[PDB]
A paper describes a structure:
The Lon AAA+ protease (LonA) is a ubiquitous ATP-dependent proteolytic machine, which selectively degrades damaged proteins or native proteins carrying exposed motifs (degrons). LonA belongs to the AAA+ (ATPases associated with various cellular activities) superfamily and contains an N-terminal domain (NTD), a middle ATPase domain with conserved Walker motifs for ATP hydrolysis, and a C-terminal protease domain (CTD) with a serine-lysine catalytic dyad in the active site. Substrate recognition of LonA is thought to be mediated by its NTD. Collectively, our results showed that the NTD of LonA selectively interacts with protein substrates via critical hydrophobic residues of its N-lobe, demonstrating that the NTD enables LonA to perform protein quality control by selectively interacting with proteins in damaged or unfolded states.
We obtained crystals of the N-terminal fragment NN206 of MtaLonA by in situ proteolysis during crystallization. The structure was refined to 2.1 Å resolution with a free R factor of 24.9% (crystallographic R factor is 20.9%). NN206 forms a bilobal fold: (1) the N-terminal lobe, which consists of one α-helix and six β-strands, forming three β-sheets (β1/β3/β4/β5, β2/β5/β4, and β1/β6/β5); (2) the C-terminal lobe, which is exclusively α-helical, consisting of a five-helix bundle. The two lobes are jointed together by an 18-residue linker, which is similar to that of both EcLon and MacLon. Here we report the crystal structure of an N-terminal fragment of MtaLonA determined at a 2.1 Å resolution, demonstrating that it is similar to the structures of both EcLon and MacLon NTDs, but not to that of BsLon. We further applied multidimensional heteronuclear NMR experiments to assign the observed cross-peaks in 1H–15N TROSY-HSQC spectrum of NN206 (BMRB code: 50697) and the NMR-derived secondary structure of NN206, based on the Chemical Shift Index, was highly similar to its solved X-ray structures. NMR analysis indicates that thermally damaged Ig2 induces significant CSPs and broadened resonances in the NTD N-lobe, which comprises one α-helix and three β-sheets β1/β3/β4/β5, β2/β5/β4 and β1/β6/β5. The residues of MtaLonA NTD with the pronounced CSPs are part of the interaction interface located mainly at helix α1, loop L1, L2, L3, and β-sheet β2/β5/β4, which consist primarily of hydrophobic residues and are decorated by a number of polar residues. By analyzing the NTD of MtaLonA interactions with damaged Ig2, the scrambled lysozyme, and Sul20 peptide, we conclude that these binding events are mediated by two hydrophobic patches, which comprise (1) L10, V14, I15, P22, V23, and M85 (termed hpI in the following); (2) M75, L77, P78, and L82 (termed hpII). In contrast, the structures of the N-terminal fragments from MtaLon, EcLon, and MacLon show that the N- and C-lobes are joined together via a short linker.
Author numbering:
A (entry chain A): 0 to 206
B (entry chain B): 0 to 113, 115 to 206
The structure:
């Protein structure tokens, strides 16, 4: 449990969940200025999804409250003037207190993952998640996923990482992934991911 | 049933369907230049949804093939340098052959709407009005004004009914794009009804 003052990168149509390392294309000037503060300092940064992908310059009201604390590990330039930035999402963050300035900066609380005392149900849910995800991948039609990613999921045995990684790979809406991010209770989080997977499997099987 | 060369406006996260008049916020320079060509000419324009909302400078491959032919009705220069444009979409368009230039321009074929098996269509229409009333009743997120819902209930044109419901529903771009691309009327009505019934099951699930 920490409190950090970090620059904030708004994500138009993406939710980053902890335990994921992903490249983020960064086109907007204010997002770029947030990246260079991070790289010039401790490389810590907040990533927060927008409520509306079409908003060009989001204010605090345009952003969800919860995001992730991430590490900026390296940045690259592309033929375009955008920056591809590799980010390591570490933990959920409640990003509340935005500070006036030329770009988005805020103080937020970074949250530990609390393991429930009902470990037995969680262990069953973990096995139900891996089974449901394997069928989701087998019966999905538009899903991009490499073999090594699929074996990582099946080899993960922590529930918190398993839920977060599955939610990252699945093709759910921002609002649906945002709710996974905001469910701190682990068994409720596992049951939401499983409900969404079963829902899509039902829909896949009809056709 | 004509082929026209018009400027094209890419939409990041919106699908426009015929029979709708909607505001379009226009931030990108190429989108702004495409609007003013329309305003300086016959005010006709193509609106095409992007496949990926995060793409800043879409190429033809970044766009769906089908869009709408619309009339630019008014433009509001906003303080942040954006253009709010009111557009009335009037017909489906297959936007195929994009033209070299500083912004998106393309030739596309505009398709008029022509009621098949009137017996099934009538059943689907009545089933649609009922499902929509409950969809509106059992969502939890949707903002519809009274005049809009009574417009739905009084409409007896099937094409207008399907397109208007798809406009109001909170479905993804890909799902609404599928409504746009179903030119055969009975298949379109059966898709809209399936999506509403699908959502009705999930709403009562809680």
């Amino acid at each position: 449990h920490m409190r950090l003052e970090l620059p904030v990168i708004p994500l138009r149509n993406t939710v980053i969940l902890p335990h994921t390392t992903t490249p983020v294309d960064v086109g907007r000037a204010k997002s770029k200025r947030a990246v260079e503060e991070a790289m010039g300092a401790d490389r810590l940064i907040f990533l927060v999804a927008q409520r509306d992908p079409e908003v060009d310059d989001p204010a605090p009201d345009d952003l969800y409250t919860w995001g992730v604390q991430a590490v900026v590990k390296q940045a690259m330039r592309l033929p375009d003037g955008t920056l591809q930035v590799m980010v390591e999402a570490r933990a959920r963050a409640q990003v509340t207190d935005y500070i006036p300035g030329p770009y988005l900066r805020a103080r937020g609380e970074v949250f530990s993952e609390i393991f429930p005392i009902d470990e037995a149900v969680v262990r069953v849910l973990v096995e139900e998640l891996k089974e449901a995800f394997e069928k989701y991948v087998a019966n999905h039609k538009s899903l991009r996923l490499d073999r090594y990613q699929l074996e990582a999921v099946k080899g993960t045995s922590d529930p918190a990482m398993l839920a977060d990684t599955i939610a990252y790979h699945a093709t759910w809406t921002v609002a649906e992934k945002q709710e996974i991010l905001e469910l701190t209770d682990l068994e409720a989080r596992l049951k939401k991911v499983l409900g969404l997977l079963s829902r899509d499997l039902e829909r896949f099987e009809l056709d």
